[PDB]
Amino acid sequence: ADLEDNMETLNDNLKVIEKADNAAQVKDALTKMAAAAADAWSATPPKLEDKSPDSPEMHDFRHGFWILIGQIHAALHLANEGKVKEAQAAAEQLKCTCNACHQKYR
Amino acid sequence: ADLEDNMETLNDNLKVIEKADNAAQVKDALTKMAAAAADAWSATPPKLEDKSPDSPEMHDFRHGFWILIGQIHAALHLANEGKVKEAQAAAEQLKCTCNACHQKYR
Amino acid sequence: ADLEDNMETLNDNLKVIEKADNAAQVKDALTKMAAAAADAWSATPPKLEDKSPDSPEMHDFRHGFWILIGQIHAALHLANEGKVKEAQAAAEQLKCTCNACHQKYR
Amino acid sequence: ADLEDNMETLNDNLKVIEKADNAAQVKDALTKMAAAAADAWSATPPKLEDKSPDSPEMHDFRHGFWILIGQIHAALHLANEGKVKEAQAAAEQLKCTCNACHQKYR
Numbered sequence: 001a002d003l004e005d006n007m008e009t010l011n012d013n014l015k016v017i018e019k020a021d022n023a024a025q026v027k028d029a030l031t032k033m034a035a036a037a038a039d040a041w042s043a044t045p046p047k048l049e050d051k052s053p054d055s056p057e058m059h060d061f062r063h064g065f066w067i068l069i070g071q072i073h074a075a076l077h078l079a080n081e082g083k084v085k086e087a088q089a090a091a092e093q094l095k096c097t098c099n100a101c102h103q104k105y106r
Numbered sequence: 107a108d109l110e111d112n113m114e115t116l117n118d119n120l121k122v123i124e125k126a127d128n129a130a131q132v133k134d135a136l137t138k139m140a141a142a143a144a145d146a147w148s149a150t151p152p153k154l155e156d157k158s159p160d161s162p163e164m165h166d167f168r169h170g171f172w173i174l175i176g177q178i179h180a181a182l183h184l185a186n187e188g189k190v191k192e193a194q195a196a197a198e199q200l201k202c203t204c205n206a207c208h209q210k211y212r
Numbered sequence: 213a214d215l216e217d218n219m220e221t222l223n224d225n226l227k228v229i230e231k232a233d234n235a236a237q238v239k240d241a242l243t244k245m246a247a248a249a250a251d252a253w254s255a256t257p258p259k260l261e262d263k264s265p266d267s268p269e270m271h272d273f274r275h276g277f278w279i280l281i282g283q284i285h286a287a288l289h290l291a292n293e294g295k296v297k298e299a300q301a302a303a304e305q306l307k308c309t310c311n312a313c314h315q316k317y318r
Numbered sequence: 319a320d321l322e323d324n325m326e327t328l329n330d331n332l333k334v335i336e337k338a339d340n341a342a343q344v345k346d347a348l349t350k351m352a353a354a355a356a357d358a359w360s361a362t363p364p365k366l367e368d369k370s371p372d373s374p375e376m377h378d379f380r381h382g383f384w385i386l387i388g389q390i391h392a393a394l395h396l397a398n399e400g401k402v403k404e405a406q407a408a409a410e411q412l413k414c415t416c417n418a419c420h421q422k423y424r
């Protein structure tokens with residue numbers, strides 16, 4: 001899909017997890033975030049369309065999604081062990097990424 | 107879906123990656139493998155039907171999918187940087203995780 | 213060093229982190245655990261000395277340390293951001309690994 | 319140690335890995351690179367002396383070492399399975415992380 005669409009999914013499902021109650025809501029939100037993150041991974045942001053597909057900036061932008069995807073799956077690891085509260089905490093801690101990448105490329 | 111269905115999707119797209127020609131081909135297979143692996147993550151294999159869901163055996167079973175998905179996303183990292191031959195070798199290498207879990211639980 | 217020595221380091225520093233107060237104690241304990249885990253990674257446990265260096269069992273044993281090392285560094289990630297309490301939680305959650313691997317190879 | 323000292327250790331052992339012949343050689347270099355990277359993790363680069371330690375810029379700076387150490391341990395995974403040529407190619411590939419952080423903060 002489209003990069004701003006992916007970011008909406010990321011942000012909505014982030015708030016679903018905060019308000020979630022059971023383990024199925026959390027696990028399904030995290031699944032949607034993973035899918036969106038993997039979709040964004042191949043997009044070119046506005047402020048980088050001038051640079052080369054193989055530039056260090058583009059590499060760095062993609063690395064931001066690699067990191068986020070790992071964190072989302074580390075949260076899925078916890079939720080699939082039944083530790084729903086610890087998975088919600090991990091989803092909160094994810095924030096350091098959405099903000100590091102925004103500061104540079106949003 | 108079924109654990110067996112997930113395993114069929116993993117096996118099929120592994121073969122696709124070994125025969126692919128273009129990066130978009132390798133990229134779509136890895137993406138399907140990641141989803142199948144995430145869905146398999148929650149399953150109980152027959153050999154463990156009797157164990158408690160919080161036993162170490164189920165913990166260890168789920169860890170296999172966590173390591174597998176991490177390897178799939180590392181291959182996706184190479185694919186999305188354009189390095190298709192490297193992604194294909196990455197897909198080849200992750201058969202150590204397939205074989206390790208099969209020896210234990212298949 | 214020696215595998216039982218590494219396990220002592222792992223277990224001691226695990227309890228240092230629980231009792232820790234500031235961010236330097238936690239970060240230094242986690243550093244020692246990482247070093248021990250990386251040292252154990254190349255050892256052969258008692259109950260596996262019969263099998264081949266390249267057997268799926270040996271692969272699986274090493275994968276256990278790869279996983280643990282990642283978790284320790286995910287905890288270092290948090291401690292280096294100043295989130296000492298969240299790093300202590302992550303060190304607690306590490307437990308699913310020490311127990312999954314013990315159940316199989318200890 | 320100094321950030322500059324850590325960078326020198328990283329650079330030196332990268333060269334060692336490209337010229338190595340035996341697995342023990344590749345394994346010791348990666349191990350030294352992992353320690354240098356963990357020690358660099360806490361440093362402040364000159365370009366960021368003015369930013370707050372909890373700014374997104376420092377978060378992003380520290381994330382670079384987290385991704386780098388993950389890549390180093392993935393190469394160590396191959397090395398400890400005996401696949402030295404694969405570990406050497408893994409070391410080669412992680413220069414994307416070197417170049418990405420240098421473009422931003424060196």
Ligand code: HEC
Pocket residue numbers: 109110111113114116117120151152167168169170171174200201203204205207208211212
């Ligand atoms: C545990 C963590 C596993 C990992 C990692 C992989 N597989 Fe697997 N696989 C697993 C089980 C328990 C089973 C048996 C399920 C059952 O109900 O019997 C399987 C089975 C397969 C099969 C057989 C499928 C069939 O139609 O009968 C295949 C072809 C297969 N697995 C492939 C496969 C690949 C390619 C993997 C890595 C990419 C892999 N599996 C990992 C458990 C686990």
Ligand code: HEC
Pocket residue numbers: 321322323325326328329332363364379380381382383386412413415416417419420423424
């Ligand atoms: C940030 C996350 C970095 C990563 C990843 C890597 N490096 Fe780096 N490096 C970084 C900085 C801020 C600096 C400058 C430090 C300063 O005080 O000026 C450097 C510098 C180097 C150097 C120069 C060393 C010197 O003696 O002047 C080298 C040779 C170097 N870096 C190598 C290197 C390699 C091989 C890396 C990946 C394996 C790598 N760096 C990653 C910040 C970051």
Ligand code: HEC
Pocket residue numbers: 003004007008010011014045046061062063064065068094095097098099101102105106
């Ligand atoms: C790069 C590595 C990013 C990461 C990680 C995250 N986001 Fe982001 N996001 C990024 C860009 C380049 C943009 C702008 C794209 C554009 O077309 O302008 C965004 C945008 C958003 C927005 C605003 C979207 C809007 O229509 O206003 C939000 C609310 C947002 N992103 C949320 C978000 C969250 C919660 C993240 C962490 C889970 C996250 N993003 C990560 C680049 C990157």
Ligand code: HEC
Pocket residue numbers: 215216219220222223226257258273274275276277280306307309310311313314317318
């Ligand atoms: C394999 C992947 C392991 C992981 C992960 C952890 N441990 Fe372990 N441990 C392992 C083995 C094969 C052994 C026995 C080795 C032997 O020579 O007999 C151990 C041993 C221990 C012990 C007891 C040591 C003793 O002298 O009695 C403890 C207390 C211990 N290990 C702790 C520990 C912790 C806290 C771990 C997680 C952080 C952990 N181990 C992981 C194999 C593996």
Ligand SMILES: [Ca+2]
Pocket residue numbers: 110
């Ligand atoms: Ca069948």
Ligand SMILES: [Ca+2]
Pocket residue numbers: 110114
């Ligand atoms: Ca079948």
Ligand SMILES: [Ca+2]
Pocket residue numbers: 322
């Ligand atoms: Ca100097």
Ligand SMILES: [Ca+2]
Pocket residue numbers: 322326
């Ligand atoms: Ca110098």
Ligand SMILES: [Zn+2]
Pocket residue numbers: 096097289293377381
């Ligand atoms: Zn962070």
Ligand SMILES: [Zn+2]
Pocket residue numbers: 202203271275395399
């Ligand atoms: Zn392996």
Ligand SMILES: [Zn+2]
Pocket residue numbers: 077081165169308309
């Ligand atoms: Zn676990």
Ligand SMILES: [Zn+2]
Pocket residue numbers: 059063183187414415
């Ligand atoms: Zn890269």
